[PDB]
Amino acid sequence: EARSLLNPSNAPTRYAERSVGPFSLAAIWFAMAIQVAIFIAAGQMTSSFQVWQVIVAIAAGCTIAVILLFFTQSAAIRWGINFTVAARMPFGIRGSLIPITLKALLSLFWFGFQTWLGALALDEITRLLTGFTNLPLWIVIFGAIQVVTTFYGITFIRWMNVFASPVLLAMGVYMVYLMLDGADVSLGEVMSMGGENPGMPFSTAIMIFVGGWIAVVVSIHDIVKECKVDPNASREGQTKADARYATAQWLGMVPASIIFGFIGAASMVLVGEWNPVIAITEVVGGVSIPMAILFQVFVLLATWSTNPAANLLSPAYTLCSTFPRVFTFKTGVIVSAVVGLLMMPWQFAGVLNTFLNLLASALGPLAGIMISDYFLVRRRRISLHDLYRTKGIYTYWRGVNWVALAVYAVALAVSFLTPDLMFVTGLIAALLLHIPAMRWVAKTFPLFSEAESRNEDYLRPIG
């Protein structure tokens, strides 16, 4: 009858195997939010609003991201499953491969972009000690270092981000000090220096910060399937569990991204550049070789706390989980970091900036259909047995659910009627159409299964 798709890497993650509680998850989100993108974003916003408003658009954009997390993360915590595996539910066991390929492409692209910034940094550090300046060699060596620390999966991420967090927070508070002092300006003064060219709606501002988390929010499964759960909660104890985790991510990502957003904005407004390295250099009138090396140790420490967890984890699990007898987790990581780099993406980001903003916001229906299938349609009632099997209640028409790929198409179109909010309209649209679409497919294929009684077999302790 049915081929088995289970292997030790892509198997649900047992209660006894879980290792990330609520404080640690905040400490991962604190180090995961400090990274280049937010200097650029918050810097360019000072053109349309003043610095204090940029801080508010950031806190607001941070908060909408968490309300979405509360919903997209809930199934992964309870049942210990993948992103790639969980998509099998609404789209087919094979039909899921379409949107997931969309998503694995973004992730792989950005992995090579950030691998690049890391290389620039190590390369700046070496030639400021040796005049030696080879970049392509330093690219590879870094791609390589990340791969080897990612082999330890969430064990490394979590220990590395907990020790990085405080170092980064201090390197950052010193940074604000060097600036304010050297420009001779109080904090309150800089807080209103922007916004001399209004025009952009404040709503579209918030949407620019949320649009930086999208791809991570649409697939946290790959991190949070590792969080601690009490199997014996209730509808209401499970809900507080969901809420306690969403709260931990909030206290982690807000104060981190508010402090560093402010640094990017201040640079623009004091000196005309979003990059604090340059801006502090001017304001202070040159700096010693040590304190320079510092700036570069920072950039490197900030990339390592973001790249692996956000960009490399998820294509790894897609490989070892679609070709389960061909790839394993450790092996999928090696193939992803290689494909990522042979796209040599650091040369098309300039061009493609606008193309990629489209591809990202075209995951709105993907997030919308998955929240709806699991919460509204199935009522949290799922069958692990069938997710790991070629022929079961998730096979639909020969592996693909054409009605769901249709709800996807229709919703992406409706999405275009509202360009500055594309992502959020497509999600809301996909969410609502899936309901009637799914009560129709259900007349032909069943929505629940008997084998769902083996669910606890996958998780509980063996002996």
Query: What residues make contact with Na ion under the rule CB under 5 A?
Result: 34-35, 302, 305-306
| Contacted by 11, from Hg ion, Na ion, none: CB < 5 to 8 Å by type | none
Report if residue 427 touches Hg ion, rule: CB under 5 A.
no
- Our CB check for Na ion shows the closer of 49 and 304 to be 304
Paired tokens of 381: 């009632």
Inter-helix orientation angle 51-72/364-372, to 10°: 40
Q: Which residue, 61 or 315, has its beta carbon nearer to Hg ion?
A: 61
Closest distance of CB 41 from Hg ion, Å: 9
Between 304 and 317, CB nearer to Na ion? 304
Q: Which is nearer to Na ion, 50 or 305 (CB)?
A: 305
* Between 275 and 306, CB nearer to Na ion: 306
305 makes contact, choosing from Hg ion, Na ion, none, with CB < 5 to 8 Å by partner type, with Na ion
DSSP per residue over 136-196, as a string?
HHHHHHHHHHHHHHHTTHHHHHHHHHHHHHHHHHHHHHHHHHHHHHHHT--HHHHTT---S
Is residue 411 a contact point for Hg ion (CB under 5 A)?
Answer: no
Which CB atom, from 95 or from 261, has the smaller least distance to Hg ion?
261
Under rule CB under 5 A, which residues in 248-267 are in contact with Hg ion? 257
CA dihedral 85, 89, 95, 98 (to 10 degrees): -60
Q: How far is the CB of 174 from Hg ion (least distance, A)?
A: 23
Any contact of residue 306 with Hg ion (CB under 5 A)? Answer: no
- Cα distance between residue 178 and residue 10, in whole Å: 48
Buried b vs exposed e over 2-32: b needs ≥16 C-beta within 10 Å? eeebbbebbbbbeeeebebebebbbbbbbbb
For Hg ion, which is the closer residue by CB, 220 or 411?
A: 220
Torsion angles phi and psi, residue 20, rounded to 5:
-115, 110
Per partner kind, with CB cut-offs from 5 to 8 A, the member of Na ion, Hg ion, none near residue 62 is Hg ion
Tell me the two tokens of residue 253: 């990502």
306 binds, among Hg ion, Na ion, none (CB under 5 to 8 A by kind): Na ion
> From Hg ion, Na ion, none, which one binds at residue 302 (CB under 5 to 8 Å depending on kind)?
Na ion
* 62 near Hg ion, rule: CB under 5 A: yes
CB of 352 to Hg ion, least distance (A): 23
Our finding on whether 122 is near Hg ion (CB under 5 A) is no
Residue showing the smallest CB distance to Na ion in the complex: 305
CB of 114 to Na ion, least distance (A): 9
- Whether 127 contacts 292, CB under 8 Å: no
Tokens, residue 162: 């907990």
User: Contact between 275 and Hg ion (CB under 5 A)?
Assistant: no
* CA separation for the pair 211, 421 (Å, rounded): 10
Contact by Cβ (8 Å): 423, 363: yes
Select the binding partner of residue 96 from Na ion, Hg ion, none (C-beta < 5 to 8 A, by kind).
none
**Contact between residue 427 and residue 367 where contact means Cβ atoms under 8 Å apart:** yes
* 247 CB neighbour count, 10 Å cutoff: 15
Could you tell me the smallest distance in angstroms from the CB atom of residue 39 to Hg ion? Answer: 13
Angle, CA 31 vertex, CA 129 and CA 266 arms, to 5° = 75
Show contacts with Hg ion in window 176-195 (CB under 5 A): none
CB of 36 to Na ion, least distance (A): 9
Name the token pair of 100.
């997931």
- Residues near Hg ion, by CB under 5 A: 61-62, 257
